[PDB]
Amino acid sequence: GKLQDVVNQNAQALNTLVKQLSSNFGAISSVLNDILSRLDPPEAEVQID
Amino acid sequence: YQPYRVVVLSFELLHAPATVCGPKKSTNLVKNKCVNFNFNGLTGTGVLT
Amino acid sequence: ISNCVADYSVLYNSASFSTFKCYGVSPTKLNDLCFTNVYADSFVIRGDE
């Protein structure tokens, strides 16, 4: 179990990092390709930021 | 006080098959070579198999 | 409005509109987007309102 905890913490701290790519953070959408396809530059720079 | 003629358009961007679409020309696809695909507006880049 | 094709490139170039404001979508990029359903509401309201 001592060796399993290290694996169970690395693989879990990575899932939480990967799953954070699908959060809006206050923007219109959480995927970047779908923001540039429906917003002009001067008002898309604030949604990206 | 002059009368103005007002129309409001709202777009449903839910997850469903697309019915209303813009004036674009569909092109035949290629496989095993990543392309800037635009399936119903799904912008991306990757090979198709 | 559904099960159809809609053109927005000439919508701004069709005639003279006092107010053409879009929220969340850039009007120039409306020519390459697909929507599940589109709604339209019509009425008459004075200019100051």
Tab-separated table of C-alpha atoms in Angstrom:
chain	number	residue	atom	x	y	z
A	1	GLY	CA	0.000	0.000	0.000
A	2	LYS	CA	2.936	2.362	0.497
A	3	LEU	CA	3.826	2.058	-3.194
A	4	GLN	CA	0.181	2.209	-4.316
A	5	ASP	CA	-0.480	5.563	-2.629
A	6	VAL	CA	2.170	7.283	-4.761
A	7	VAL	CA	0.534	6.002	-7.950
A	8	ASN	CA	-2.941	6.831	-6.611
A	9	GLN	CA	-1.846	10.442	-5.980
A	10	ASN	CA	0.015	11.133	-9.231
A	11	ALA	CA	-2.729	9.655	-11.420
A	12	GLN	CA	-5.380	11.501	-9.384
A	13	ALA	CA	-3.628	14.882	-9.396
A	14	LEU	CA	-3.474	14.555	-13.197
A	15	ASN	CA	-7.155	13.708	-13.690
A	16	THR	CA	-8.103	16.787	-11.666
A	17	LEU	CA	-5.775	18.834	-13.882
A	18	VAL	CA	-7.177	17.386	-17.118
A	19	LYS	CA	-10.800	17.724	-15.984
A	20	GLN	CA	-10.173	21.444	-15.390
A	21	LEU	CA	-10.005	21.986	-19.167
A	22	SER	CA	-13.829	21.765	-19.241
A	23	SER	CA	-14.690	24.667	-16.922
A	24	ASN	CA	-16.010	28.013	-18.123
A	25	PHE	CA	-14.133	30.143	-15.542
A	26	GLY	CA	-16.633	32.895	-16.383
A	27	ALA	CA	-16.363	32.749	-20.181
A	28	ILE	CA	-19.061	31.931	-22.730
A	29	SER	CA	-17.656	28.437	-23.322
A	30	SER	CA	-14.911	26.186	-21.976
A	31	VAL	CA	-13.547	25.156	-25.408
A	32	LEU	CA	-11.299	27.685	-27.120
A	33	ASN	CA	-12.017	26.684	-30.729
A	34	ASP	CA	-15.726	27.471	-30.282
A	35	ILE	CA	-14.990	31.034	-29.119
A	36	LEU	CA	-12.872	32.124	-32.092
A	37	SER	CA	-15.530	30.820	-34.501
A	38	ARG	CA	-18.305	33.138	-33.261
A	39	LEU	CA	-16.519	36.239	-31.940
A	40	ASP	CA	-14.524	39.019	-33.574
A	41	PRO	CA	-10.984	39.810	-32.337
A	42	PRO	CA	-11.746	43.024	-30.386
A	43	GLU	CA	-14.351	41.297	-28.175
A	44	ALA	CA	-12.898	37.766	-28.155
A	45	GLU	CA	-9.713	38.888	-26.383
A	46	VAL	CA	-11.724	39.401	-23.184
A	47	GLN	CA	-13.381	35.965	-23.283
A	48	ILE	CA	-10.041	34.243	-23.911
A	49	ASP	CA	-8.324	36.150	-21.094
B	1	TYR	CA	-41.798	59.011	-30.175
B	2	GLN	CA	-41.414	57.821	-33.775
B	3	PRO	CA	-42.415	54.183	-34.400
B	4	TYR	CA	-39.504	51.808	-34.979
B	5	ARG	CA	-39.865	48.296	-36.365
B	6	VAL	CA	-38.099	45.773	-34.129
B	7	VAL	CA	-37.264	42.091	-34.645
B	8	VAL	CA	-35.226	39.988	-32.199
B	9	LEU	CA	-33.405	36.809	-33.245
B	10	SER	CA	-32.240	34.199	-30.722
B	11	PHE	CA	-30.104	31.184	-31.648
B	12	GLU	CA	-30.373	27.811	-29.911
B	13	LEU	CA	-26.859	26.378	-29.508
B	14	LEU	CA	-27.962	23.191	-27.743
B	15	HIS	CA	-26.655	19.691	-28.494
B	16	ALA	CA	-28.845	18.424	-31.338
B	17	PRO	CA	-28.677	17.785	-35.095
B	18	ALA	CA	-28.223	21.076	-36.918
B	19	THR	CA	-31.132	22.358	-39.016
B	20	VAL	CA	-30.384	26.042	-39.686
B	21	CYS	CA	-26.965	26.562	-41.266
B	22	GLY	CA	-25.099	29.245	-43.161
B	23	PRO	CA	-24.243	29.452	-46.866
B	24	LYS	CA	-21.139	27.269	-47.095
B	25	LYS	CA	-20.047	24.660	-49.632
B	26	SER	CA	-19.451	21.103	-48.438
B	27	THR	CA	-16.321	19.334	-49.684
B	28	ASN	CA	-15.433	15.650	-49.747
B	29	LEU	CA	-13.100	14.529	-46.973
B	30	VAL	CA	-9.736	12.770	-46.782
B	31	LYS	CA	-8.485	10.236	-44.255
B	32	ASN	CA	-5.266	9.672	-42.284
B	33	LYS	CA	-4.285	13.332	-42.792
B	34	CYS	CA	-5.273	15.978	-40.259
B	35	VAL	CA	-7.428	18.738	-41.744
B	36	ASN	CA	-9.207	21.852	-40.459
B	37	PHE	CA	-12.558	20.081	-40.388
B	38	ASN	CA	-15.767	22.067	-39.900
B	39	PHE	CA	-18.464	19.469	-39.197
B	40	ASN	CA	-21.600	21.590	-38.620
B	41	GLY	CA	-19.299	24.197	-37.070
B	42	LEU	CA	-17.161	21.816	-34.977
B	43	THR	CA	-13.848	23.531	-35.660
B	44	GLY	CA	-10.780	21.434	-34.966
B	45	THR	CA	-7.692	19.722	-36.335
B	46	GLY	CA	-6.984	15.993	-36.449
B	47	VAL	CA	-6.818	12.940	-38.698
B	48	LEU	CA	-10.066	11.181	-39.603
B	49	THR	CA	-10.350	7.388	-39.669
C	1	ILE	CA	-37.398	29.030	-37.806
C	2	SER	CA	-35.871	25.635	-38.592
C	3	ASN	CA	-35.213	23.025	-41.314
C	4	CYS	CA	-33.936	25.705	-43.674
C	5	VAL	CA	-30.939	27.751	-44.801
C	6	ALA	CA	-30.505	31.302	-43.508
C	7	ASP	CA	-28.249	33.968	-45.015
C	8	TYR	CA	-26.849	36.739	-42.818
C	9	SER	CA	-24.077	38.138	-45.042
C	10	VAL	CA	-26.534	40.371	-46.926
C	11	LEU	CA	-28.724	41.014	-43.868
C	12	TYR	CA	-26.645	44.055	-42.919
C	13	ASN	CA	-26.310	44.981	-46.610
C	14	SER	CA	-30.033	44.501	-47.325
C	15	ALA	CA	-31.373	47.888	-46.205
C	16	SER	CA	-30.871	50.628	-43.608
C	17	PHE	CA	-31.308	49.498	-39.995
C	18	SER	CA	-31.071	52.006	-37.153
C	19	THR	CA	-29.794	49.437	-34.631
C	20	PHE	CA	-28.056	46.153	-35.519
C	21	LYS	CA	-26.616	44.828	-32.249
C	22	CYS	CA	-25.588	41.227	-31.563
C	23	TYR	CA	-24.868	39.644	-28.170
C	24	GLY	CA	-22.490	36.688	-28.010
C	25	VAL	CA	-22.086	36.242	-31.784
C	26	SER	CA	-20.192	38.498	-34.168
C	27	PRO	CA	-22.460	39.407	-37.119
C	28	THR	CA	-19.632	38.985	-39.640
C	29	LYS	CA	-19.053	35.358	-38.580
C	30	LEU	CA	-22.733	34.373	-38.870
C	31	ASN	CA	-22.080	32.922	-42.344
C	32	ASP	CA	-20.384	29.719	-41.116
C	33	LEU	CA	-22.409	28.693	-38.055
C	34	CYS	CA	-25.075	26.031	-37.551
C	35	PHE	CA	-27.928	26.365	-35.055
C	36	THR	CA	-30.432	23.770	-33.873
C	37	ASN	CA	-33.339	26.246	-33.863
C	38	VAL	CA	-33.769	29.978	-34.467
C	39	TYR	CA	-36.511	32.164	-32.991
C	40	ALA	CA	-37.886	35.500	-34.193
C	41	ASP	CA	-39.983	37.977	-32.200
C	42	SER	CA	-41.684	40.957	-33.846
C	43	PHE	CA	-43.325	44.084	-32.411
C	44	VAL	CA	-43.232	47.883	-32.686
C	45	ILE	CA	-41.526	50.123	-30.115
C	46	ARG	CA	-40.595	53.805	-30.190
C	47	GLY	CA	-37.027	54.783	-30.989
C	48	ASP	CA	-35.985	56.054	-27.563
C	49	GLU	CA	-37.025	52.701	-26.057
